[PDB]
Amino acid sequence: SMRTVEVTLHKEGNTFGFVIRGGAHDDRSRPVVITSVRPGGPADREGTIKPGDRLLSVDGIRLLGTTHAEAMSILKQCGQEAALLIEYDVSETAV
């Protein structure tokens, strides 16, 4: 079911290795969604994020109401180790 997952990534060359679309606008505004993951990059190597995942927050900064440019700047300016909260249909089982 739709659940939020925390992914910690370590930037390289000040990049996470993924592409985002979306963001807020005076006219109501679309969620921030990951559109591509770069092979060999930090996101690829951590392995969780996939195209179509929603990006909810970056270090506890919620990307509700942030413009595309603000979301990009948030991603650019956060520490090398960053906690990203994403949302997708998660399969989870106690074993």
Curated annotation (Swiss-Prot):
Residues 4-90 form the PDZ domain. Coiled coil: none annotated. It is found in: Cytoplasmic vesicle; Perikaryon; Cell projection, Dendrite; Cytoplasm. Disulfide bonds: none annotated. It comes from the Eukaryota. Signal peptide: none annotated. It is linked to Fraser syndrome 3: A form of Fraser syndrome, an autosomal recessive disorder characterized by cryptophthalmos, cutaneous syndactyly, and urogenital abnormalities including renal agenesis or hypoplasia. Additional features include abnormalities of the larynx, ear malformations, and facial abnormalities. PDZ 6 mediates interaction with the PDZ recognition motif of EFNB1 and EPHB2 and with the C-terminus of PPFIA1 and PPFIA4. PDZ 4 and PDZ 5 mediate interaction with the C-terminus of GRIA2 and GRIA3. PDZ 4, PDZ 5 and PDZ 6 mediate homomultimers. PDZ 7 mediates interaction with PDZ domain of GRASP1. PDZ 7 domain binds CSPG4. PDZ 6 mediates interaction with the C-terminus of liprins-alpha. PDZ 1, PDZ 2 and PDZ 3 mediate interaction with the PDZ-binding motif of FRAS1. PDZ 4 and PDZ 5 mediate interaction with PRLHR. Interacts with EPHA7, EPHB2, KIF5A, KIF5B, KIF5C, GRIA2, GRIA3, GRIPAP1/GRASP1, PPFIA1, PPFIA4, FRAS1, PLCD4, PTPRF and liprins-alpha. Can form homomultimers or heteromultimers with GRIP2. Forms a ternary complex with GRIA2 and CSPG4. Interacts with ATAD1 in an ATP-dependent manner. ATAD1-catalyzed ATP hydrolysis disrupts binding to ATAD1 and to GRIA2 and leads to AMPAR complex disassembly. Interacts with EFNB1, EFNB3 and the C-terminal tail of PRLHR. Interacts with SLC30A9. Interacts with BUD23. May play a role as a localized scaffold for the assembly of a multiprotein signaling complex and as mediator of the trafficking of its binding partners at specific subcellular location in neurons. Through complex formation with NSG1, GRIA2 and STX12 controls the intracellular fate of AMPAR and the endosomal sorting of the GRIA2 subunit toward recycling and membrane targeting. This is Glutamate receptor-interacting protein 1. It comes from Homo sapiens (Human). The gene is GRIP1. The chain holds residues 149 to 239 of 1128 of the full protein.
